[PDB]
Amino acid sequence: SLTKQPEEVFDVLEKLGEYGSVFKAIHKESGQVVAIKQVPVESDLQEIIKEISIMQQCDSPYVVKYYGSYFKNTDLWIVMEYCGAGSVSDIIRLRNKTLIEDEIATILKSTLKGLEYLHFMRKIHRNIKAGNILLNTEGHAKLADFGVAGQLTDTMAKRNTVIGTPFWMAPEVIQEIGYNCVADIWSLGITSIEMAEGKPPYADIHPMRAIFMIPTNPPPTFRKPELWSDDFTDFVKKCLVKNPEQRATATQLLQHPFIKNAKPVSILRDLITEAMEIKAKRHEEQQRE
Numbered sequence: 001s002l003t004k005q006p007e008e009v010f011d012v013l014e015k016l017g018e019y020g021s022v023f024k025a026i027h028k029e030s031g032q033v034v035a036i037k038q039v040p041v042e043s044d045l046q047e048i049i050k051e052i053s054i055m056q057q058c059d060s061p062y063v064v065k066y067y068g069s070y071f072k073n074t075d076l077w078i079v080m081e082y083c084g085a086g087s088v089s090d091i092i093r094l095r096n097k098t099l100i101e102d103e104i105a106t107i108l109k110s111t112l113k114g115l116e117y118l119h120f121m122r123k124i125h126r127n128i129k130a131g132n133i134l135l136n137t138e139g140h141a142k143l144a145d146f147g148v149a150g151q152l153t154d155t156m157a158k159r160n161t162v163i164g165t166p167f168w169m170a171p172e173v174i175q176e177i178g179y180n181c182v183a184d185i186w187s188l189g190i191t192s193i194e195m196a197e198g199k200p201p202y203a204d205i206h207p208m209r210a211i212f213m214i215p216t217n218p219p220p221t222f223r224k225p226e227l228w229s230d231d232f233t234d235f236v237k238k239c240l241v242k243n244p245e246q247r248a249t250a251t252q253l254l255q256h257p258f259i260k261n262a263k264p265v266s267i268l269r270d271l272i273t274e275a276m277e278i279k280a281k282r283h284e285e286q287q288r289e
Contacts, residue, residue, distance in 0.1 A: 006070040006077055012036060014283065016086075019043060024082065027067075034067060035082040041074040047148070047158075052078065054123070054146055062114030064134060064144040083142060084276060085135035088195060091275040092130065099195045101232050103271065105262040107133065108192060110141035112259060115188065116250035118143070119181040126151065126179050128187035129168045130194045139265030139272060152177050166207055167200040171215040172244045182244045185253070189239025190220070192232070197223060215242075231258035 010025040020039040027034055039048055055066035067079040085091060088107060092098055099107070111133055118125055125132075126147025134144045151162050152173075166174070170186030173179055194200045201220040202210035219240035222228050235258035241247040253259060 006072050009070070010034070010036065010079070024084075025079075027079075033082045033084070035080045037078040037080065038072075039076045039078065041076070043076075044158075045076070048076070048078070050148055051146065054148075055080075058118070058121070058123075060114065060117045061140065062110055062117060062142055064142045081142070082136070083134035083144070084137040085139075085272045086275065086279065087131050087144075088133045088135065088141075089130040090279075091135065091271065092195070092198060094275045094278045095271065098198045099271075101196070101229060102263050102267055104192060104195045104232070105258055106139075106265060106267060107135070107141045107195070108188065109254070109259050109262040110265075111143065111188065111191075112250050112254050114141070114143040115181075115184050116254065119184070119250055122181075124149075124179045124181050125184045125187075127162075127168070128184050128191060129200075130191050133191070135268070135272060137272065137276070139268035147179075149179075163211070164207055166211045166214065167202050168194075169211075169214060170244065171242050174211055174215050180244065182247050182249070185239050185247050185250065186241075186244075188253075189236050192236050192239065193220060193222065196228070196232075218242075229258075231256070231261075235259065 009029070010027055013024040013026070016022045016024050016035065020037055020043065022035055022037045025034050025036045026032070039045070052066060052069070055064070059065070064083065065081040067081070069079065070077040086094070088099070111128075115125065115128070124147075125143060126149075127145065128143075132143065132145045134142050136142065147162070152159060168187040168190045170183045173183050173186075190200045202213060205213070219237070219242055222233065222236070225233055235253070235256050238248045238253065238256065248256075
């Protein structure tokens with residue numbers, strides 16, 4: 001209860017991916033499957049601790065939860081909510097297939113409920129993108145891997161990590177070099193395009209050229225608007241308002257027709273079965289050698 005070591009509390013299973021390796025595990029006492037990230041002591045712990053604290057302060061079905069921490073041989077074990085389907089980006093990659101409208105609407109609805117919660121608590125995500133939206137085995141989307149306040153003006157190495165990938169940044173974020181809540185909504189719009197087409201606009205363009213273009217150019221649109229309904233088209237248009245003062249909020253977008261008519265998560269069941277089957281299959285093959 002108070003005496004037993006981490007390996008008596010959790011049955012640690014297969015590595016799931018990647019700062020540090022993330023493993024799947026079962027919390028023995030309650031049977032609940034969890035994810036455990038193992039961070040070596042050499043790491044930037046103060047950055048991790050910042051991230052852990054942000055998680056602890058969140059308590060929402062739409063944000064990945066933190067359960068606690070343990071030490072084992074200099075490594076720090078961070079125990080979190082397990083999302084077995086991986087990220088949206090992973091699901092797209094694994095199945096080699098973009099998401100159809102219904103699928104996007106259903107996921108973005110839960111994503112928007114996450115943003116609304118965060119924005120209500122005066123928090124900003126800062127790195128909204130398909131890669132940071134995670135799905136559990138039930139099809140419930142949850143926000144994860146938040147950015148941190150002041151990340152654009154930290155030391156060079158940590159800062160260049162952010163600047164190096166600017167495709168999801170709102171115009172004002174580039175112009176003012178900071179974030180407000182409303183910046184997440186722009187990123188959501190870019191993410192909706194990403195989920196439908198497989199990449200954000202400017203993705204294949206040199207990052208510094210994208211940084212110049214974002215505040216200069218008109219708002220992005222679908223490459224082929226004819227393939228998409230008016231609700232989806234208009235939803236993206238509302239997200240991608242360049243003037244942050246005129247950009248829809250999370251609460252407002254939750255009443256947009258595209259979102260308000262989202263189908264239940266049951267429509268995601270097959271694509272999650274597929275994504276997970278593909279990930280497990282490649283896992284068998286990778287250890288075969």
